[PDB]
Design a binder for this molecule. Structure first.
Ligand SMILES: O[C@H]1[C@H](O)[C@@H](O)[C@H](O)[C@@H](O)[C@H]1O
Ligand SMILES: [Zn+2]
Ligand SMILES: [Zn+2]
Ligand SMILES: [Zn+2]
Ligand SMILES: [Zn+2]
Length: 296
């Protein structure tokens, strides 16, 4: 029993999508620097804040991909950071929130990108990868298989997207060379072609066109089941009120959301945005989710 309207329940939108559809094919909203929502100091915010609400709000609003940046501590734990700044959020904090969300909504899956954001603290008994694997990944909540991961196998679990080196355990999407500030194409789990638009520090106009260009490619290659498209709409801070991630998101989110609304495509990729909220219309994450209508 699956209807297109079930995509409108932002907490269970993946439910109507078939088990055999690769996550790569699905158009999924994601949040950039997901754990920066606790930053209070205006100076820290203008430079590194990318979200206003916590993880559950993000999830309840359709986001299923999270950009987690961590640092290994002397306590053999991983805490979230933005460069040298501790975000007052921990990795366990995110996983627990994800666990709760998945328990409440078992039809969904959570894709967690994990990147080492800052140098390890002195005193850790191991490495970033060995500590994450031993104290976190062992948890049954993490999918342990790879390949072109299908939705059915991911439901109720966290799917890892590695952005760190040294992994020694199978599961999720393998780490791959990720060039700096570019739109690039490469491969991951042997059979998945990946294209990423991550020009995080280009001028505003270059960024908008970059997002649209990669989305245009995605919309016209909608039947490529083993191709993964990740499109970051986020743009790094200029350090001022008129060029902070917030100011940029205020215009980019509605702009790109309108592109999808007008075009009404069957695929737009994994769209990772800053500031998921309901302040700007059309809502990007909603339009991204609605782009899965043809899969039902
Ligand atoms: O500041 C940037 C931005 O967060 C990009 O999205 C990420 O891919 C880069 O690694 C980071 O340096
Ligand atoms: Zn929290
Ligand atoms: Zn300590
Ligand atoms: Zn392809
Ligand atoms: Zn809301």
């Amino acid at each position: 029993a699956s209807s297109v309207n079930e995509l409108e329940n932002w907490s269970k939108w993946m439910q109507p999508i078939p088990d055999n559809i690769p996550l790569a094919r699905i158009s999924i909203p994601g949040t950039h620097d997901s754990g920066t929502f606790k930053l209070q100091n205006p100076i820290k915010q203008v430079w590194g804040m990318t979200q206003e609400y916590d993880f559950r709000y993000q999830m309840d609003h359709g986001a299923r991909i999270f950009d987690i940046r961590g640092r290994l501590t002397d306590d053999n734990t991983i805490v979230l950071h933005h460069g040298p700044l501790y975000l007052y959020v921990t990795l366990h904090e995110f996983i627990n929130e994800a666990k709760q969300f998945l328990k409440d909504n078992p039809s969904e899956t959570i894709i967690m990108s994990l990147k080492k954001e800052y140098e390890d603290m002195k005193g850790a008994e191991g490495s970033f990868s060995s500590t994450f694997e031993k104290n976190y990944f062992v948890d049954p909540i993490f999918l342990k298989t790879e390949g072109n991961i299908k939705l059915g196998d991911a439901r109720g679990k966290i799917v890892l997207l590695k952005r760190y080196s040294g992994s020694n355990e199978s599961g999720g999407y393998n780490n791959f060379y990720w060039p700096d500030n570019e739109t690039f194409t490469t491969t991951v789990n042997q059979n998945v072609n990946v294209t990423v638009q991550d020009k995080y520090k280009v001028n505003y106009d270059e960024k908008v066109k970059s997002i649209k260009d990669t989305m245009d490619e995605t919309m016209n290659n909608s039947e490529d089941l083993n191709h993964l498209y990740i499109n970051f709409t986020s743009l790094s801070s200029g350090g001022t009120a008129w060029n902070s991630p917030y100011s940029y998101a205020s215009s980019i989110n509605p702009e790109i959301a309108n592109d999808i609304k007008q075009k009404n495509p069957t695929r737009v990729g994994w769209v990772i945005q800053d500031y998921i909220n309901e302040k700007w219309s059309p809502l990007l994450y909603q339009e991204v989710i609605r782009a899965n209508k043809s899969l039902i």
